[PDB]
Amino acid sequence: RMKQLEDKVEELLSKQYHLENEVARLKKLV
Amino acid sequence: RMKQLEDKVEELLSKQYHLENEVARLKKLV
C-alpha cells in the first residue's frame, strides 16, 4: 500500500535531516 | 513501483543507523 510506504519515506527522510545536523553541531563542539 | 518504494525505505534505515552510530561516537567525545 503506497501512501503508507510513501509516508514512511517522508518520515525517515526528515529524521535523517535532523540527525545529520546533529552530528554537524556535535563536530564543532568536538 | 512498490518494490521501489520498498527498497527506498530499506536504504533509508541503513543511513539512519550509520547516523545514530556516529552521533553516539560524537557523544562520548564530549
UniProtKB/Swiss-Prot annotation, chains A, B:
Region (Leucine-zipper) location: 5-26
UniProt induction comment: Translation is induced by amino acid or purine starvation, or during growth in low or poor carbon sources. Translational repression during nutrient-rich conditions is dependent on four uORFs (upstream open reading frames) present in the 5'-UTR of the mRNA; these promote ribosome dissociation. Translational induction occurs in conditions reducing translation machinery efficiency, leading to ribosomes scanning over the uORFs, and increased translation of the mRNA. The rapid translational induction is followed by transcriptional induction at later time-points, independently of the uORF sequences.
UniProt subcellular location: Nucleus
Transmembrane intervals: none
Disruption of the gene: reported phenotype: Abolishes recruitment of the mediator complex to the upstream activating sequence (UAS) of amino-acid starvation responsive genes. Decreases RNA level of genes involved in amino acid biosynthesis and cofactor biosynthesis during amino acid starvation or methyl methanesulfonate stress. Growth dependent on amino acid supplementation. Sensitive to amino acid starvation. Sensitive to purine starvation. Decreases cellular glycogen levels during glucose starvation.
Post-translational modification: Phosphorylated by the cyclin-CDK PCL5-PHO85.
Family the entry assigns: Belongs to the bZIP family. GCN4 subfamily.
Subunit text: Homodimer. Each subunit binds overlapping and non-identical half-sites that flank the central CG base-pair in the pseudo-palindromic motif 5'-ATGA[CG]TCAT-3'. Interacts with the mediator tail; the interaction with GAL11/MED15 is direct. Interacts with the SAGA histone acetyltransferase complex. Interacts with the SWI/SNF chromatin remodeling complex.
Domain commentary: Residues 89 to 100 and 106 to 125 define the N-terminal activation domain (NTAD) and the central acidic activation domain (CAAD) respectively, which can function independently to promote high-level transcription of the target genes.
Described function: Master transcriptional regulator that mediates the response to amino acid starvation. Binds variations of the DNA sequence 5'-ATGA[CG]TCAT-3' in canonical nucleosome-depleted 5'-positioned promoters, and also within coding sequences and 3' non-coding regions. During nutrient starvation (low or poor amino acid, carbon or purine sources), it activates genes required for amino acid biosynthesis and transport, autophagy, cofactor biosynthesis and transport, mitochondrial transport, and additional downstream transcription factors.
Protein name per its UniProtKB record: General control transcription factor GCN4
Gene giving rise to this polypeptide: GCN4
Residues of the full protein shown: 249 to 278 of 281
